[PDB]
Design an enzyme around this catalytic site. Sequence first.
Site, PDB file in Angstrom:
ATOM      1  N   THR B  45      -1.172   3.087   5.088  1.00  0.00           N
ATOM      2  CA  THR B  45       0.100   2.577   5.598  1.00  0.00           C
ATOM      3  C   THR B  45       0.426   3.177   6.961  1.00  0.00           C
ATOM      4  O   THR B  45       0.817   2.461   7.892  1.00  0.00           O
ATOM      5  CB  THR B  45       1.225   2.883   4.608  1.00  0.00           C
ATOM      6  OG1 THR B  45       0.798   2.557   3.279  1.00  0.00           O
ATOM      7  CG2 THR B  45       2.465   2.071   4.960  1.00  0.00           C
ATOM      8  N   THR B  46       0.265   4.497   7.093  1.00  0.00           N
ATOM      9  CA  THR B  46       0.554   5.186   8.349  1.00  0.00           C
ATOM     10  C   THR B  46      -0.366   4.740   9.479  1.00  0.00           C
ATOM     11  O   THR B  46       0.008   4.845  10.653  1.00  0.00           O
ATOM     12  CB  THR B  46       0.444   6.698   8.127  1.00  0.00           C
ATOM     13  OG1 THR B  46       1.213   7.060   6.970  1.00  0.00           O
ATOM     14  CG2 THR B  46       0.939   7.479   9.340  1.00  0.00           C
ATOM     15  N   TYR B 109       3.845  -7.507  -2.284  1.00  0.00           N
ATOM     16  CA  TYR B 109       4.411  -8.846  -2.099  1.00  0.00           C
ATOM     17  C   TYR B 109       4.252  -9.756  -3.318  1.00  0.00           C
ATOM     18  O   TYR B 109       5.224 -10.403  -3.719  1.00  0.00           O
ATOM     19  CB  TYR B 109       3.821  -9.508  -0.843  1.00  0.00           C
ATOM     20  CG  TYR B 109       4.370 -10.882  -0.520  1.00  0.00           C
ATOM     21  CD1 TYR B 109       5.737 -11.092  -0.378  1.00  0.00           C
ATOM     22  CD2 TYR B 109       3.516 -11.964  -0.312  1.00  0.00           C
ATOM     23  CE1 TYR B 109       6.242 -12.348  -0.071  1.00  0.00           C
ATOM     24  CE2 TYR B 109       4.014 -13.227  -0.003  1.00  0.00           C
ATOM     25  CZ  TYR B 109       5.376 -13.410   0.111  1.00  0.00           C
ATOM     26  OH  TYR B 109       5.875 -14.659   0.423  1.00  0.00           O
ATOM     27  N   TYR B 135      -2.596   4.337  -5.596  1.00  0.00           N
ATOM     28  CA  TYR B 135      -1.560   4.618  -4.606  1.00  0.00           C
ATOM     29  C   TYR B 135      -0.337   3.787  -4.975  1.00  0.00           C
ATOM     30  O   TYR B 135      -0.367   2.555  -4.893  1.00  0.00           O
ATOM     31  CB  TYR B 135      -2.067   4.311  -3.193  1.00  0.00           C
ATOM     32  CG  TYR B 135      -1.071   4.441  -2.053  1.00  0.00           C
ATOM     33  CD1 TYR B 135       0.142   5.106  -2.204  1.00  0.00           C
ATOM     34  CD2 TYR B 135      -1.351   3.872  -0.821  1.00  0.00           C
ATOM     35  CE1 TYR B 135       1.040   5.195  -1.152  1.00  0.00           C
ATOM     36  CE2 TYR B 135      -0.471   3.953   0.227  1.00  0.00           C
ATOM     37  CZ  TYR B 135       0.718   4.619   0.065  1.00  0.00           C
ATOM     38  OH  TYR B 135       1.586   4.689   1.124  1.00  0.00           O
ATOM     39  N   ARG B 140       7.666  -0.059  -0.733  1.00  0.00           N
ATOM     40  CA  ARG B 140       6.952  -0.939   0.184  1.00  0.00           C
ATOM     41  C   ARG B 140       6.288  -2.126  -0.501  1.00  0.00           C
ATOM     42  O   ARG B 140       6.177  -3.189   0.113  1.00  0.00           O
ATOM     43  CB  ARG B 140       5.875  -0.163   0.951  1.00  0.00           C
ATOM     44  CG  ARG B 140       6.387   0.924   1.874  1.00  0.00           C
ATOM     45  CD  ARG B 140       7.262   0.352   2.965  1.00  0.00           C
ATOM     46  NE  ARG B 140       7.557   1.333   4.005  1.00  0.00           N
ATOM     47  CZ  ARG B 140       6.815   1.512   5.094  1.00  0.00           C
ATOM     48  NH1 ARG B 140       5.730   0.771   5.287  1.00  0.00           N
ATOM     49  NH2 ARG B 140       7.158   2.431   5.991  1.00  0.00           N
ATOM     50  N   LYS B 164      -1.904   8.672  -5.709  1.00  0.00           N
ATOM     51  CA  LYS B 164      -0.999   9.104  -4.672  1.00  0.00           C
ATOM     52  C   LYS B 164       0.362   8.489  -4.993  1.00  0.00           C
ATOM     53  O   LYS B 164       0.561   7.275  -5.041  1.00  0.00           O
ATOM     54  CB  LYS B 164      -1.451   8.690  -3.259  1.00  0.00           C
ATOM     55  CG  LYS B 164      -0.428   8.859  -2.152  1.00  0.00           C
ATOM     56  CD  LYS B 164      -1.005   8.250  -0.892  1.00  0.00           C
ATOM     57  CE  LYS B 164      -0.023   8.265   0.278  1.00  0.00           C
ATOM     58  NZ  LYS B 164      -0.433   7.422   1.378  1.00  0.00           N
ATOM     59  N   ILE B 205      -1.318  13.573   0.680  1.00  0.00           N
ATOM     60  CA  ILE B 205      -1.761  12.640   1.716  1.00  0.00           C
ATOM     61  C   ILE B 205      -0.554  12.459   2.621  1.00  0.00           C
ATOM     62  O   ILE B 205       0.405  11.760   2.266  1.00  0.00           O
ATOM     63  CB  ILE B 205      -2.268  11.314   1.141  1.00  0.00           C
ATOM     64  CG1 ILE B 205      -3.584  11.556   0.396  1.00  0.00           C
ATOM     65  CG2 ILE B 205      -2.475  10.283   2.260  1.00  0.00           C
ATOM     66  CD1 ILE B 205      -4.052  10.398  -0.463  1.00  0.00           C
TER      67      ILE B 205
END
Lengths: 296, 296
Positions: B45-46, B109, B135, B140, B164, B205
Amino acid sequence: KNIIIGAMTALITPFKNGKVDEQSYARLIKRQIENGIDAVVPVGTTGESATLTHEENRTCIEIAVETCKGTKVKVLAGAGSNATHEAVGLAKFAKEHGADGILSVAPYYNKPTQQGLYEHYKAIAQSVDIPVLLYNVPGRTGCEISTDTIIKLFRDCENIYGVKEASGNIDKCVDLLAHEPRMMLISGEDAINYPILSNGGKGVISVTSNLLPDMISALTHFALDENYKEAKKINDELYNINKILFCESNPIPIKTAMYLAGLIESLEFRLPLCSPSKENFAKIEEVMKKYKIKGF
Amino acid sequence: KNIIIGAMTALITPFKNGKVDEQSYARLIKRQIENGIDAVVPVGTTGESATLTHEENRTCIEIAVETCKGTKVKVLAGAGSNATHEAVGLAKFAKEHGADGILSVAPYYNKPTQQGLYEHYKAIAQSVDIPVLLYNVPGRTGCEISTDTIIKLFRDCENIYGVKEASGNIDKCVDLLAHEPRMMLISGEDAINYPILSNGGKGVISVTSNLLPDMISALTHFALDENYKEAKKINDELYNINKILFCESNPIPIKTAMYLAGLIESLEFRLPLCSPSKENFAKIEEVMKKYKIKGF
Ligand SMILES: NCCCC[C@@](N)(CC[C@](N)(CCCCN)C(=O)O)C(=O)O
Ligand SMILES: [Mg+2]
Ligand SMILES: [Mg+2]
Ligand SMILES: [Mg+2]
Ligand SMILES: [Mg+2]
């Protein structure tokens, strides 16, 4: 502004052996046309846009455009993405291949700011000359297009003409139309179709209409004629099926219902979507018995 | 099980003129290695995975693998997707090109059910023979991998070794490790790195480690050595920057901080991400002055 309003269907995408069943897809669109639907939305959330390829997204748009030729029914093509360059590419394809407008979902997963949402939709709107309907569904995307951002986009971009709201927030619907009564507010939440229409909304983009297009079409048309008694009556009658179609994540229940009604041949999804539980399969089947379901 | 734990960095992806700056990326990874990091996560994501192409996703993984050669530092490749066929393909590339494991975000989504999440991750896990870290980031993605689903996947799939967690839910962290103490719980939420580690979590992370890799590495390694007093001290010292790095959606603040510190040459995002407001730009700069930022 050029607009696309009225009773609209977020089309399911039938699969056969993991492939888009292109014949069934056209057949389903014909059934929508013959039951009073005014626009079809290929490859929205309900059409499993996430798991189609960019090519399959384009193929389904082509089938919709070709099937609606010679009819009043418009094609509001699903062309959103969480990457602006992807959304621009999809919008340009839809315009070039005869779509009447595009539905463009707010970016999911990467959570843009209001400034980023503005630039995202500005880039999309400036890339084509057909109407653009925003689509706010924060429960799926993780972000919210604020009222101020929607109104700015409506006022600043010629072809952005409204928003499909799927946020369970009638307060925001009042906020939108009280400050900008010229926009086209579209219900993206079947259970509250009538309340959104009675506040000045001008259409719906419906899941339930996949199964009951005549009832959703009648509801919308009564409402647009300010026959609110009749529109509310249909909304009330539809509440049970409107809610059961979300007992699991859409489009799992609606594809299940279409299969149970004999409208699609196989109950096939693309992972990570899959069949519902045995209990929910039975609850969907039970609620369906209350309604008269049109055939082909 | 083979595992990848310890102090890990969710790498930002620097852009120059809209292109992945590959030389800057390698330099940033080396800086992480030199400051005690145990693994790097390319294109999470980052790293703006959403707006990179599948090919740029594959390029960043290769640069990470190549930069870590000759060191103990592992590459835990970002390879998740909301389409299972996409996630399998990404996992297979990462394996084929030398990644030590994969980080696989829950589908965003399209909101799969728990059954769909199970089948999604089983298909991924059966496609490679390298470790797979789940994760969970519901803010999000719009979905949650339940504790039961995580535990089933851990027990049923040899190479799924942990998760995560970026859900702001320490109760769930207790739930996970009380019922399955063999899994590797990894913090994906910098502000609560220490509480997760003190409950038996085995790594982080991190977003903050992009800017302060030495502090995040020390915190994690103190905790793993059961020097909880020193780990908490660093966690408390880092709280202010840990929160300001989310004053706008990650990675907008961390890229802003890296640019302010001279670690990247341009403050470039890909739409729909964009620069922060002038106010938040100043807030980030103000919080940075409390911290000693390592150079190259
Ligand atoms: N409508 C058909 C396209 C579907 C593509 C995608 N599955 C993934 C979109 C993507 N931006 C691809 C990034 C690939 C590099 N990691 C995403 O996963 O965010 C999505 O938008 O849901
Ligand atoms: Mg206001
Ligand atoms: Mg009339
Ligand atoms: Mg269990
Ligand atoms: Mg339990």
